[model samples]
Target: AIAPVITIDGPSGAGKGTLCKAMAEALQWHLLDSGAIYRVLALAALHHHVDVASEDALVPLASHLDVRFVSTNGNLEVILEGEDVSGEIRTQEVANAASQVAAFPRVREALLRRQRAFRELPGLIADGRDMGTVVFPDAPVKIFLDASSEERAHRRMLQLQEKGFSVNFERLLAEIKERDDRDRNRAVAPLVPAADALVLDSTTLSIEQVIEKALQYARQK
Candidate 1:
């Protein structure tokens, strides 16, 4: 039988990335970091002078996008056109562009098959805004992880500071909230819990607690 899927859907900075990493490593399952795909695409567009908001302009670009993620020595390395662009795509600008492009339904639809192919024999952990809702509605286990905007902003600020980048608290918070609004209110695959998903508010939970709770819920299913 093909592998089953465990989908984790949520807004950015809610610890879903960390949670997915733990589960993937523990289960030795393939991982689908779907947002990163969009992030890379967004960065590609920015680099080559494409509009992030235009579906007609972006659709063809998405079809022939050259991007790849490879794991080497336990670290994920993103390759674009034979050169590593991992570091370039991790910037806040790329992330914002990704959220913007992801708002387009055609963009999401174009990437659907690629994301679904991440499902392999040992199982897959899909991490993104709509893994449970759009890409894997039949997934046996789905989780919606969430946290307060303030808390999420705090987490992001700390992360940026750690990388030696200066951060503005007010601006960061505003950006986070704005992105959340766009992602949650978008017409296609807006961020929301699947009907059968376990909703865990992570505003007060630790990394361990959230993972434990999500995994436990999956196990019980």
Candidate 2:
């Protein structure tokens, strides 16, 4: 009796964001960016001087975090404590902090229910590293999108450039590898796909091709 959910699990810069967005729009279902939730909690902890390693501190922070999405003019804004933090939480610093805090097992447990609440009657498209493995393990359609680490770094560099940020290619690649190692090695909710997931390696495929493949796979489900 569960609402149908589609989980897209992947590493950074794996085209999950764009793919999930298109799927949400095409299916007219809600979308959940689970990474953003962690990033926002990291940002909140930063502002409050909370220690990342202190599970006692982070559990309360995670459970009562006032995070919401507001749609205005067809744009979704991430609101933290009545303040719009749409742009603030997307930085490299926040991403690193998010990964650090997200590694805690108790912190992950604290946020599970909030992530599950995104599922609704029509359905949901969840985009995150552990969406299928942890948050939505019962999801009917699960996909694991992956690409070479070098390709991921290239995509990340291009994404930053479009946001008016210049980055060193080597540094970006190193960071991507660092995050990958941490996510894959984390004790809880580690980055992995459900056994039933359809794995899509988009290393050489255009985004359009990837989307087509995903759509076809989903329809067959």
Candidate 3:
């Protein structure tokens, strides 16, 4: 049988990443962090001097982008053109740049195959803004995890603090809202839930509660 896939779709700070990790581990399935792919592409474009405003320019680049994900010590490391960019792509600049390039319709289409390749035997857990709507529309299980903008911003601030990067909450909150709007308003594959997806608002839920809710819905037979 073709391996089943579960897609967790939502904006940043919706706990999609964490939920996907837990589900992947619990179900012994592969994981596809689709955001990282776009981030790497943005980094690659910046390195190659490609302009983000040129959609035509980015279409070909996105199709033939040289990127790899390596498993090192149980953590997936993103490599771009033989250079380890796992750290570089996580910056706020790359994050915004990714939103820029990822906005192109053809660019999103080009990365579809690469993203789908992650699906394998046992199952697959895919997480991103468009996982269910664009990348994995046929996924048997789909979740639209969301929370209030303020709550999401708070979670993001704490995450950055853990990485030793102190940022102004007001500025961080503004950026988060901007990015969320950009993706949600994009022409192709905008951030929205698939019609069949189960919507879960994580504004008041703990990590464990969110995981259990998704798992219960996923394991229903």
Candidate 4:
């Protein structure tokens, strides 16, 4: 039997990551962090000095991209080319590069097969900008989690601060808007909720409340 999938599609800092993790834990399902794959691809390209602007260079690189997600101590460790890149890929530079590369049609196509391979026995919790819209269109429960740009930026700032990274709220907010525009305006597999998805505006919802609401919705579906 094909494993069920719950797709949580959303922009950055809207709490998709936390929701996916909680859902995966509650259901004991596998988790697919699709955004990490794109970030890894962007990091690999940078490591190899591959031109990010050239789809010709990226498609082949994406197809053969050596990346892995290993669960260690209840945390997902991102490995690229046998090196731990969990922290490296989280940088704003890598994130922007990931958005740029992910915009390319062929690059997303190349990664699609890899993303789908995460499906397995019990189930899967897939999270990304296009998880529901593009990567897992047939997902049984699809959620589009969103918040105002300012709210997202505030959440991201807190996250970054917790990670010991100083951040400028204004700059972070600007970058969030820029990335959202690119993700929304990109020609292929743009960041949009699937037609059948449940759109959740998380602007004022606490994490616990969001999880409770999402779980209730998924159960009803």
Alpha carbon lDDT of each predicted model: 0.86, 0.88, 0.88, 0.90
Question: What is every candidate's alpha-carbon RMSD to the true fold?
Answer: 1.4, 1.4, 1.4, 1.2
In candidate 2, what are the lDDT values of residues 90-197, reduced to their tens digit? 876788889889988889988998889888868989999999888988888999999889999999899898888878899989989999999988899998878999
Per-residue lDDT of candidate 3, residues 1-221 (tens digit): 89999999998999987798888888888888999999988888888899877889888888888888764345778888788898899887898899888898889999988898888888889999888888889999999999988889999899898988977789888988998999888888999999999999899999999999999999994
Q: Candidate 4 has which clashing residue pairs, if any?
A: none
* Residue-by-residue lDDT tens digits, candidate 1, 90-137: 887888798878877888887777778888878999999889989999
Off by over 4 Å in 2: 71-73
The number of clashing residue pairs in model 2 is 0
lDDT of 4 by residue, 1-221 (tens): 98899999988889998899999888888999998999999999999999999999999999999998875458888999898998899887898899889988999999999999999979888999888877888899999999899999998899889978889899999989998999988999898889998999889999999999999888876
Task: Tell me which residue pairs clash in candidate 1.
Answer: none
Candidate 4 lDDT score relative to the true structure = 0.90
**Worst-scoring 10-residue span by lDDT in model 3:** 67-76
Candidate 4 runs further than 4 Å off: none
Ranking according to lDDT, highest score first: 4, 2, 3, 1
Q: TM-scores, in order shown?
A: 0.95, 0.95, 0.95, 0.96
Best by lDDT: 4
On the 0 to 100 scale, the lDDT of residue 152 in model 4 is 96
Lowest summed lDDT over 10 consecutive residues: which window, candidate 1? 67-76
**Model 2, position 81: C-alpha lDDT score:** 90
Tell me the TM-score of model 1. 0.95
